[PDB]
Write a protein that holds these residues in place. Structure first.
Motif, PDB file in Angstrom:
ATOM      1  N   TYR A  51       7.535  -3.330  17.966  1.00 12.08           N
ATOM      2  CA  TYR A  51       8.434  -2.962  16.881  1.00 12.08           C
ATOM      3  C   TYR A  51       7.943  -1.646  16.292  1.00 12.08           C
ATOM      4  O   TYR A  51       6.876  -1.596  15.673  1.00 12.08           O
ATOM      5  CB  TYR A  51       8.492  -4.059  15.820  1.00 12.08           C
TER       6      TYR A  51
ATOM      7  N   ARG B 157      -1.328  -4.408  14.916  1.00 10.31           N
ATOM      8  CA  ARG B 157      -0.857  -3.084  14.528  1.00 10.31           C
ATOM      9  C   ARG B 157      -1.702  -2.039  15.239  1.00 10.31           C
ATOM     10  O   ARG B 157      -2.916  -1.974  15.029  1.00 10.31           O
ATOM     11  CB  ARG B 157      -0.936  -2.894  13.015  1.00 10.31           C
ATOM     12  CG  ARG B 157      -0.748  -1.456  12.566  1.00 10.31           C
ATOM     13  CD  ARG B 157      -0.507  -1.372  11.069  1.00 10.31           C
ATOM     14  NE  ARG B 157      -1.670  -1.809  10.305  1.00 10.31           N
ATOM     15  CZ  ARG B 157      -2.705  -1.030  10.018  1.00 10.31           C
ATOM     16  NH1 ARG B 157      -2.723   0.229  10.432  1.00 10.31           N
ATOM     17  NH2 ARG B 157      -3.724  -1.508   9.318  1.00 10.31           N
TER      18      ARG B 157
ATOM     19  N   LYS C  51      12.101  -8.790  19.646  1.00 21.09           N
ATOM     20  CA  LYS C  51      11.055  -8.404  18.711  1.00 21.09           C
ATOM     21  C   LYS C  51      10.935  -6.895  18.548  1.00 21.09           C
ATOM     22  O   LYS C  51      10.261  -6.438  17.618  1.00 21.09           O
ATOM     23  CB  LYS C  51       9.712  -8.981  19.163  1.00 21.09           C
ATOM     24  CG  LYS C  51       8.962  -9.733  18.077  1.00 21.09           C
ATOM     25  CD  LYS C  51       9.636 -11.056  17.759  1.00 21.09           C
TER      26      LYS C  51
ATOM     27  N   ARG D 246      -4.439  -4.984   3.849  1.00 26.06           N
ATOM     28  CA  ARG D 246      -4.227  -3.844   4.723  1.00 26.06           C
ATOM     29  C   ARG D 246      -2.966  -3.104   4.306  1.00 26.06           C
ATOM     30  O   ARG D 246      -2.071  -3.661   3.665  1.00 26.06           O
ATOM     31  CB  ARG D 246      -4.141  -4.271   6.193  1.00 26.06           C
ATOM     32  CG  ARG D 246      -5.502  -4.535   6.813  1.00 26.06           C
ATOM     33  CD  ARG D 246      -5.396  -4.944   8.268  1.00 26.06           C
ATOM     34  NE  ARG D 246      -6.715  -5.101   8.874  1.00 26.06           N
ATOM     35  CZ  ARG D 246      -6.938  -5.729  10.024  1.00 26.06           C
ATOM     36  NH1 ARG D 246      -5.929  -6.266  10.694  1.00 26.06           N
ATOM     37  NH2 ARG D 246      -8.172  -5.826  10.500  1.00 26.06           N
ATOM     38  N   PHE D 247      -2.920  -1.827   4.661  1.00 25.05           N
ATOM     39  CA  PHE D 247      -1.798  -0.966   4.319  1.00 25.05           C
ATOM     40  C   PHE D 247      -0.852  -0.909   5.508  1.00 25.05           C
ATOM     41  O   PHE D 247      -1.284  -0.664   6.639  1.00 25.05           O
ATOM     42  CB  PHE D 247      -2.255   0.449   3.958  1.00 25.05           C
ATOM     43  CG  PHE D 247      -3.140   0.538   2.741  1.00 25.05           C
ATOM     44  CD1 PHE D 247      -3.621  -0.590   2.102  1.00 25.05           C
ATOM     45  CD2 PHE D 247      -3.488   1.776   2.237  1.00 25.05           C
ATOM     46  CE1 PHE D 247      -4.437  -0.480   0.994  1.00 25.05           C
ATOM     47  CE2 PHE D 247      -4.295   1.886   1.129  1.00 25.05           C
ATOM     48  CZ  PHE D 247      -4.769   0.758   0.506  1.00 25.05           C
TER      49      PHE D 247
ATOM     50  N   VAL E 286      -0.254   3.566   7.404  1.00 25.13           N
ATOM     51  CA  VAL E 286      -1.421   4.427   7.562  1.00 25.13           C
ATOM     52  C   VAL E 286      -1.547   4.806   9.030  1.00 25.13           C
ATOM     53  O   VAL E 286      -1.143   4.054   9.920  1.00 25.13           O
ATOM     54  CB  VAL E 286      -2.733   3.768   7.066  1.00 25.13           C
ATOM     55  CG1 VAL E 286      -2.682   3.467   5.586  1.00 25.13           C
ATOM     56  CG2 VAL E 286      -2.991   2.484   7.836  1.00 25.13           C
TER      57      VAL E 286
ATOM     58  N   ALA F 135      -6.769   2.344   9.946  1.00 24.70           N
ATOM     59  CA  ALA F 135      -7.253   1.478   8.880  1.00 24.70           C
ATOM     60  C   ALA F 135      -8.073   2.282   7.883  1.00 24.70           C
ATOM     61  O   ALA F 135      -8.838   3.174   8.260  1.00 24.70           O
ATOM     62  CB  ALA F 135      -8.087   0.336   9.456  1.00 24.70           C
TER      63      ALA F 135
ATOM     64  N   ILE G  53      -0.168  -5.583   2.557  1.00 24.27           N
ATOM     65  CA  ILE G  53       0.027  -6.866   3.214  1.00 24.27           C
ATOM     66  C   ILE G  53      -1.305  -7.593   3.301  1.00 24.27           C
ATOM     67  O   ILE G  53      -2.377  -6.978   3.306  1.00 24.27           O
ATOM     68  CB  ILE G  53       0.646  -6.716   4.619  1.00 24.27           C
ATOM     69  CG1 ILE G  53      -0.012  -5.561   5.375  1.00 24.27           C
ATOM     70  CG2 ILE G  53       2.148  -6.521   4.517  1.00 24.27           C
ATOM     71  CD1 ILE G  53       0.369  -5.499   6.838  1.00 24.27           C
TER      72      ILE G  53
ATOM     73  N   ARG H  30      -3.127 -11.462   5.081  1.00 27.20           N
ATOM     74  CA  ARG H  30      -2.994 -12.551   6.035  1.00 27.20           C
ATOM     75  C   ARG H  30      -3.135 -13.895   5.334  1.00 27.20           C
ATOM     76  O   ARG H  30      -3.697 -13.998   4.241  1.00 27.20           O
ATOM     77  CB  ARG H  30      -4.035 -12.431   7.150  1.00 27.20           C
ATOM     78  CG  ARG H  30      -5.465 -12.321   6.657  1.00 27.20           C
ATOM     79  CD  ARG H  30      -6.446 -12.211   7.816  1.00 27.20           C
ATOM     80  NE  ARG H  30      -6.541 -10.850   8.334  1.00 27.20           N
ATOM     81  CZ  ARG H  30      -5.840 -10.389   9.365  1.00 27.20           C
ATOM     82  NH1 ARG H  30      -4.990 -11.183  10.002  1.00 27.20           N
ATOM     83  NH2 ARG H  30      -5.993  -9.135   9.766  1.00 27.20           N
ATOM     84  N   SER H  31      -2.609 -14.932   5.980  1.00 25.94           N
ATOM     85  CA  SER H  31      -2.666 -16.294   5.468  1.00 25.94           C
ATOM     86  C   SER H  31      -3.506 -17.148   6.406  1.00 25.94           C
ATOM     87  O   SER H  31      -3.294 -17.128   7.623  1.00 25.94           O
ATOM     88  CB  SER H  31      -1.263 -16.888   5.322  1.00 25.94           C
ATOM     89  OG  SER H  31      -0.644 -17.041   6.586  1.00 25.94           O
TER      90      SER H  31
ATOM     91  N   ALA I 118       7.854  -7.102  11.014  1.00 28.52           N
ATOM     92  CA  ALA I 118       8.114  -6.815  12.421  1.00 28.52           C
ATOM     93  C   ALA I 118       8.452  -8.087  13.188  1.00 28.52           C
ATOM     94  O   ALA I 118       9.394  -8.108  13.986  1.00 28.52           O
ATOM     95  CB  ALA I 118       6.908  -6.113  13.045  1.00 28.52           C
ATOM     96  N   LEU I 119       7.694  -9.157  12.956  1.00 30.59           N
ATOM     97  CA  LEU I 119       7.968 -10.449  13.567  1.00 30.59           C
ATOM     98  C   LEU I 119       8.466 -11.492  12.580  1.00 30.59           C
ATOM     99  O   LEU I 119       9.235 -12.371  12.971  1.00 30.59           O
ATOM    100  CB  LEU I 119       6.712 -10.988  14.264  1.00 30.59           C
TER     101      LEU I 119
END
Lengths: 308, 308, 308, 308, 308
Positions: free
Chosen positions: A19, A98, A141, B70-71, B74, B77, B124, B126-127, B168-169
């Motif tokens: 994507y 990413r 996707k 995270r951005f 960019v 990272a 963003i 993560r979980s 994206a997903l």
């Protein structure tokens, strides 16, 4: 960690997609465009079934084996980062990361303002115990919504096809995956910036056919040649290197040739008018008035036919 | 290290902020601006209560679990470094770090000298075991005081809002956090540098309407066209690529068109004056004297209305 | 390794200094100057006393705890390398390292040829068990001797002061240390390169007030305008971006305005001389001869007063 | 690994050398030239004697202690790679590595086409148990054969001397080693590229002293000034920044002054010829014909004496 | 891991090859061209024989010893990545990797539009227990098919030869391997872009020999000199530095000299025509008409002979 064992019925067909997020850099001269997009993988493997005693599971990037996916056409290995791995309880791995890299797509400025380019990404994987069918893409996707960025292109197509080509060594039967992004330049920006002013300066030069003053004619034509060279200097900072040819690079040569012919005509007219042939000089002058725009239109049509 | 266990009443709402320090680099053509700022996080966790038997406690960066922030936008990272972690005895973690990165904010030069831009940062996380409410910002830790740096912009707003957009997903229900910095160019620098000299050269061209000498008129108009192209060369090194359009890029086209019309008028006047029509030539000349400034003002007003 | 235990009488006051070595890169447009200098630290700690049974002792960089000293204003953490650690037998640690980094000092080209700039370095440290007094500098270890490098500046002062400013979060009572290097441009290089030729071209333009030929006057003034724009193109490659204002950038605008007024005067003189008013045209011409240099000197003095 | 124990008779005098390979990059404006060369070390230590029961022995780079050799003048620590370590059975270590780095040699363009520069490399080492005499060089391992690369310089000398200078802290008695490479520009390339065309344009300007037409004289002189400014624009892309002075930068100022004086003379001649003084105007014209080349030669000789 | 033991009959002759993929970057001024290609190695070693109880075997990159192959001419060690190692059951190792690096090939622009260059890659290996014969190449694994990229060159030859040259230290008997890629520029792009317009402007200058007006002659010749300098400015952005000489750089000097001679001739003609010698002026004018094209052709032929 080893790849999950196969049933031997078929090779592991991992689904992949990318994507687009930001194809920000377009180094036309370097023929490298830099993108920082997301790539998603989905494949079947043994994991938490959870049919007895869920919603989603997430492991660590260094725990699960992820297939080694690399880009054929990059300056260096993609600057990637694992974002989200989903071990779906029905049983699968969904690895989204990413990555940012230069893609090395050779642009083709044969028709610079009206070009239609095709950015290319080639995907390869390694084989450990069995082959891979990575080229199986769901085509769902992939895709960037849009943004009005420094990229002034309009996206036409995002075709993804399996293109088995000859490798450098071809030791294995590995087949690469083709991502082709066909885009078209928005040419309207260039009509009042590279095209119309050049024509205006050329017509200023041609206004020397409605005059009898040789010295004013010389001033018009040669000062207009200087102005055209200065405007070409202004334009070429925008243009790429183009060490082969260009549609807009042949119009510039046509304009140079027309300045040469205009100087020749003015000199011929003055020579005839000084050699006591005013009638012939006037006839040549009127013929030039009619002919120079006509020959310029004919040359432009011929060039358009040759290039388009 | 695992995230601290939840009470299941609500997801862990970590408070975040970014205090700008140096948004030094502004690569307009690349549409990337580089900043080296500080980011502060504050969240509740079990730690030294110290209610029996303080002031502050500090652990190591590799000891406490810090949420992975995270951005989205960019090149790579963020080049970060942990600065100060404060395990407050009342119970919380205050993690302040210094990061530097390119932010990838697409500028919009539709109105170049008078543009109002909006730099964008997307956050963003993560979980692992539960969702996160990172978008909860106190709006107090953010903000740069000022500096008279190479950034000639005046900061208007620093709005931070929760903008749940399609990922994206979109495998999870993660929602990104929006930092929008709305700034305005200080346009006064450009009036005597890009705007006034161009008008001066145009008026120098127009001074050819108060003259009867065709050769001097040609000298004025065509040498002024050369001067205007050279000044455009001088200006465009400051300007970005702008492959779509511009307010100051349409004024340049208007000025090119006005040079073309000035040449046409001078040629018409000379043709009439040579063809023994001095009255008509003088009438056209006076009408041009009145009209060219008037038409230029009208075109500028029309362009301003179209762009603003 | 933990910091050495304190006596609780006073916080650990580490002495610091930086000896400049090569401030080689000066990216004026980027407002970043790159230096590769040496930093020296000296502090008291328990070590080999050697009062019974020397000269010097040296440990490994990873053995002794060194205070974490970081620069507030850098693109990335300094590219440093430990050079020499001296555990003096009387008892102390002398840690000298070589670091290279971009310093992020915003230059101020309000008065470009005659500017006096102040390069800034901010020092911060972390606190583990007690505060730090790093700002205590002996002012003896700092200083570069000289070199006739691409830096054409003359160093005036190297003041180092303790400037406790508000931090991004200000969770602790940490106070940064200020290194300010005040330098002055050697302006003599610019008088015969940016200043004198522009005045020469302007005076060439003014020589059109001693002539009666309107066509030669137009040639002088407009060709001189073209020459001045070309010379401005030549100069601006040396100059930085300066998106706010400049002393030498307002002289250029004054010169543009003077070209405009010269064209206006020449046109007025020719109009009067053609309209059968030779006396008034001659009076205006002589008044211009006297006035244009006088008004230029007055404008230059006014600009100097406004900027200096 | 510790350095081999000494006999205490003398400090370990390690022999060193650098064989140049590719000094490819010459960033004159940045005053940094980048080289990727080889460095060889040879020193005595206990190893395989092999007097009873060879030819050569080779250990691993991480096994044998190698003296820490660093360059004083680099942007960052040299990008090196161990190539070949030879533990000679007679007993010694021969450590050859390939390093690439920026060397930070400040060029001096006081006499740009005819400059003789001296690239400098400074070597330092650390002391653990005893001092080092690294400055002992055999002068046999150093030297690049040649290549006709983008470096258009002719190498004159490669002197290597021991130059004990004051260090940043001078805590120890360490003495750095000096590698000085004295090279000379091949100036022939610049005579037909920067020097001869400028003189040609100046002489074109001077051809206005053989004419009586004031308007043609103005055309010659001012169009030649425009041409000279354009040629200076062309030249200065090749030249470095030079923010102090230059030999070829003072010739340009002399040429600007000569254009100014030529304009002044033409205006004076026309004023005298219009004020009904043809004899004085002709006398000034002939005197100028004789004097301008003579004064230009005198000024060039004076400048050469001042700079050489 | 140690190299496999030898039979002592002959040194280990490892077969090597490089298949070009993307020689994308060509920094002519820096004399560095950047390529991201594949390198393949094949050598005999003890491994899975599988004569009793296949197809192919693959180990890990860190398991099998791979010979240390390095490039003599690179800015830094190649950015490589192991792609596929094939332990063929008949017994051999086939190690294919993808590397990207700058190659440091000094181009030679003695004949810029018609140059034939030779990119060079030098291969070296280290010796542990026995010498190596790496120079043994099958010449079958090397070669890039093609692509119409920003590289406008036509590939002529890909010769690979063993060239034992003197090393920096020559401690061992190591012999490097030479990869020479001989390519030729497609010069057709440059005839209508750098060559034909310059000739057109020169002929515009020469059209001043068919005129008797000294002022119009001056306008033609000097405005054409300005146009030629502007076109040289336009061209030199494409050209490399070339600090030694060039074929197209000597044509530019010839054109400058011809402008000088044209100015001299025009001035001589006007002086004779004013000094009341119209016959001699006309004779010189006609002789110039015949001679200037003839002398230009002769000079171009002489330059071509000197350079080709």
């Amino acid at each position: 960690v080893s790849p999950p064992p196969p049933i031997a019925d078929e090779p592991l067909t991992v689904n992949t997609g990318i994507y687009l997020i930001e194809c920000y850099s377009l180094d036309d001269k370097a023929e490298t465009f830099k993108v920082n997009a997301f790539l998603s993988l989905s494949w079947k493997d043994r994991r938490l079934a959870f049919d007895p005693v869920v919603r989603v599971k997430t492991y660590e990037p260094e725990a699960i084996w992820i297939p080694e996916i690399r880009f054929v056409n990059v300056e260096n290995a993609r600057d990637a980062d694992v974002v989200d791995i989903s071990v779906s309880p029905d049983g699968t791995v969904q690895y989204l990361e990413r990555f940012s890299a230069r893609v090395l797509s050779p642009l083709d400025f044969r028709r610079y303002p009206f070009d239609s380019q095709t950015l290319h990404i080639y995907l390869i994987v390694r084989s450990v115990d069995t082959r891979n069918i990575v080229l199986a893409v769901d085509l769902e996707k992939v895709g960037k919504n849009d943004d009005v960025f420094l990229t002034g292109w309009d996206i036409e197509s995002f075709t993804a096809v399996v293109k088995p080509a000859n490798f450098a060594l071809e030791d294995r039967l590995e087949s690469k995956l083709d991502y082709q992004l066909r885009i078209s330049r928005q040419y309207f920006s260039y009509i009042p910036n590279i095209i119309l002013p050049m024509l205006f300066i050329l017509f200023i030069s041609w206004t020397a056919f409605w005059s009898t003053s040789y010295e004013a004619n010389v001033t018009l034509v040669v000062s207009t040649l200087i102005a055209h060279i200065a405007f070409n200097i202004l334009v070429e900072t925008n243009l790429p290197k183009t060490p082969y040819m260009t549609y807009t690079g042949a119009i510039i040569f046509m304009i140079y040739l027309f300045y040469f012919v205009a100087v020749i005509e003015v000199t011929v007219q003055h020579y005839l008018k000084v050699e006591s042939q005013p009638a012939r000089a006037a006839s040549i002058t009127r013929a030039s008035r009619i002919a120079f725009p006509v020959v310029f239109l004919l040359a432009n049509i011929i060039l358009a036919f040759l290039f388009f």
